Write a protein that binds this ligand. Structure first.
Ligand SMILES: Cc1sc2ccc(Cl)cc2c1Cn1cc(CC(=O)O)c2ccc(-c3cc(N)cc(N)c3)cc21
Ligand SMILES: Cc1sc2ccc(Cl)cc2c1Cn1cc(CC(=O)O)c2ccc(-c3cc(N)cc(N)c3)cc21
Ligand SMILES: [Cl-]
Ligand SMILES: [Cl-]
Ligand SMILES: [Mg+2]
Ligand SMILES: [Mg+2]
Ligand SMILES: [Mg+2]
Ligand SMILES: [Mg+2]
Lengths: 443, 443
């Protein structure tokens, strides 16, 4: 049904394309639309993917497309353009293209979600005949059985307790095995427990080397998801804790909301990926704490906030402009889904007035999450000559003013751990609290 | 048809099983035959695969099978036994098992071919009810299109001549690319040509390190098939010369036959494998000198010779015993195929009388190809006080006698390059020449 590329409707259509990564959906398909005389934009969340498409197209097909990223925009004048969603947003959206392919349209990072809503809101007005929502992983996808992987639940019987169940020593003594834990911390403690017990064991996370994992010999690697992005092949078995760390918003009311990195049950995509490290060129084993529960393509409300934040920080969009684009995304069927907290987030940002410009550009440059919310809290701090909620790296634009800031932090919301006393008097704190309780979904 | 495991016939059946590597054919299938009360032997060409199955079975299913290789035989007493074909032959064949699974039955190395003929000849007499010829690559398989790989023939247009066609510089300037050449020699010359031209290029073959290939950055790797067995992932494109080196027999009549490593067009398996280095997690390009021509599962007559040789050297089989087993293999449909040179090879070896025992064990130990033919030539040399055909490593059991060997080599056949004068007088030379011309297929 959605596995063939849509023929161009001679007016306006939104269409889905479910096809594997590499299969032609982002290359051969735009090539065929271009040979019929169309101009085609193809959007993707990744700078590397985007650059990779221009290499393929010119070398396979002698087609030199325009390649547009945050760094540079390469204009050849040909009919196909590749861009990241972020560069697309930075360029004003549709502002040119007959057909727009939104690639990896299952992505739930904020640039993808804002970028996609923008296409959906603007595509027809801008002269487009076709928007394609393309993906290899449609929303509601679950982990399906693999022919080469045998799946065996852990029980309570075992000498090594692990996320509420147990690993018998015998199933990891001998051969090469990968245990997934959620944090650098568990990795280290489990790695150390196992080593006490006589096992060749080694931790791996963000910021250690790939060479810390022996090519050969019995090993138990206790790792985070950093592994899949840093390292190549192997494994007789995977032991999956079945949880990850994700950005979540909590309407904690202490005074307002909390945005932090918390432990959530994994979704199908993380389950599929962690399992997929065994079964390569021979049979594999996958062991797990709990059966697959979350389908792919649900995202957190704090990603809606992040969209509003980036709209203000990067793209000179008022919160109301951000809502039209997000509304178009939430109103389009077959896309990732989320609680409808558009009115609420819009209203919060609408009263985040008179941010310090130099603070915001410092935060933007340093690359911290939520550049607008961090610089706004900082602004508020420097205007009350108060310290930031902690001296986390986040707050470094206040470090030069550190000797002159005294007293309780005027807390607007929580972006991490609290390390100073707080006052809840601030007019903006009050404003955000009233945004919460003026919204039936958020109260 | 051949994708489901055969139910046990209550008398005797030979059956085929076509199923992917890892899918259960060598593990789950024997497990299910064992739960019904059968004793199951599972044979494979690889020590590592064989050991890998015992790890899987005990860890996935709490089944500790017997694991038998050249090194050691592990006896647990359970109903499933894994063995290499070679260990099976060393143990006397069927000499116990209800069901015998011949795994990787498409293999065309001599141990697999002799091992398989032995099962086929002996299985019924020995009480077996079932022989399964199992494989992921049936004979006559061709290279089929891959959804993620775009295939583009080279033409004559290009600045870099390559196996009778050309590579334009533009298709390898920028990005990461793998060129296959047939010999360490071409690798080095092409690598050096490309470097002169401004390209980051690096050779790779048997005996250089994996680290000689940069993880990141534009590179052109000019390699042999050593690459697939030494190194892990990548590549925007593969450029395949479409030829490999294989052991071939030539009835050269100078005086008798030649067995040497020569350049042949590649078969589907080598084509599939070399192509398969691109298209991983994104789209790939494969370029080639000539369209796929050889289907898998044809092997050379010199593999029949090697079987006879190993029978004499390792397994105390007379040539006539070797023929009954090879005959059973050639008479069984759906197996690799070869010219029927059984009578001829049998007759050659039957007159290879009174080999020196110490020479043969030296050759066997040193691991040279054709241990019987090398030690027989050597024997013949030491009895004529003549030098070996060259001082290649092959002939090292004659090195201690080197000051006393003089005159022309009495050539029985050719196993490499000739580096001394030769006499064709030797009675055994005459005998082998008459084996050739007494056989209608070989004349
Ligand atoms: C650096 C970040 S983090 C983040 C998180 C959420 C959202 Cl919605 C945007 C963002 C951005 C903004 N952002 C993301 C991309 C994507 C890419 O790498 O090509 C990107 C590309 C270009 C720009 C960009 C470039 C210039 N010259 C000026 C301005 N104001 C923005 C901003 C971009
Ligand atoms: C070392 C070689 S190269 C070659 C080539 C062709 C053929 Cl038909 C056999 C052979 C052999 C013999 N060969 C191959 C294997 C397989 C494995 O590694 O388990 C193997 C295993 C065991 C034996 C083996 C073991 C003992 N103790 C005595 C004797 N006479 C043979 C010989 C073996
Ligand atoms: Cl605002
Ligand atoms: Cl003999
Ligand atoms: Mg593609
Ligand atoms: Mg250790
Ligand atoms: Mg298997
Ligand atoms: Mg170089």
């Amino acid at each position: 049904d959605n596995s063939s590329p849509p023929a161009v409707p001679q007016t306006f259509q939104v269409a889905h394309l479910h096809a594997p990564t590499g299969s032609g959906k982002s290359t051969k398909v735009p090539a065929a639309y271009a040979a019929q005389g169309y101009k085609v934009l193809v959007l993707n969340p990744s700078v590397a993917a985007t650059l990779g498409f221009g290499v393929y197209m010119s070398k396979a097909h002698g087609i030199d497309p325009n390649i547009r990223t945050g760094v540079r925009a390469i204009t050849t004048g040909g009919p196909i353009t590749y861009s990241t969603y972020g560069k697309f947003l930075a360029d004003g959206g549709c502002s040119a293209y007959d057909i727009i392919i939104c690639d990896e349209c299952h992505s739930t990072d904020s640039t993808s979600i804002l970028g996609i809503g923008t296409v959906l809101d603007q595509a027809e007005t801008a002269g487009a005949r076709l928007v394609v929502l393309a993906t290899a992983t449609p929303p509601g996808s679950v982990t399906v059985p693999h022919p080469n992987i045998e799946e065996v639940a852990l029980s309570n019987t075992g000498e090594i307790p692990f996320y509420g169940k147990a690993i018998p020593i015998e199933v990891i003594r001998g051969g090469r095995h990968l245990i997934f834990c959620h944090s650098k911390k568990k990795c280290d403690e489990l790695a150390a427990k196992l080593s006490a017990l006589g096992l060749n064991a080694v931790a791996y996370y963000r910021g250690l080397d790939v060479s810390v994992i022996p090519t050969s010999g019995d090993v138990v690697v206790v790792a985070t998801d950093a592994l899949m992005t840093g390292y190549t092949g192997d494994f007789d078995s995977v032991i999956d804790c079945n949880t990850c760390v994700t950005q979540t918003v909590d309407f904690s009311l202490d005074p307002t909301f909390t945005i932090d990195t918390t432990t959530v049950p994994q979704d199908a995509v993380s389950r599929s990926q962690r399992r997929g490290r065994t079964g390569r060129g021979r049979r594999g084993i996958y062991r797990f704490v709990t059966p697959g529960e979350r389908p792919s393509g649900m995202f957190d409300s704090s990603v809606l906030c992040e969209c509003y934040d980036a709209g203000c920080a990067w793209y000179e969009l008022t919160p109301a402009e951000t809502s039209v684009r997000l509304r178009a995304y939430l109103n389009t069927p077959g896309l990732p889904v989320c609680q409808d907290h558009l009115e609420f987030w819009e209203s919060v940002f609408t009263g985040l007035t008179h941010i310090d410009a130099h603070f915001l550009s410092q935060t933007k440059q340093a690359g911290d999450n939520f550049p607008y919310l961090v610089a706004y809290q900082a602004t508020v701090c420097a205007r009350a000559q108060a310290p930031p909620p902690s001296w986390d790296q986040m707050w470094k634009s206040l470090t030069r003013l550190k000797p002159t800031l005294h007293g309780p932090t005027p807390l607007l919301y929580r972006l991490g751990a609290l390390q100073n006393e707080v006052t809840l008097t601030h007019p903006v704190t009050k404003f955000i609290m009233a945004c919460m309780s003026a919204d039936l979904e958020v109260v």
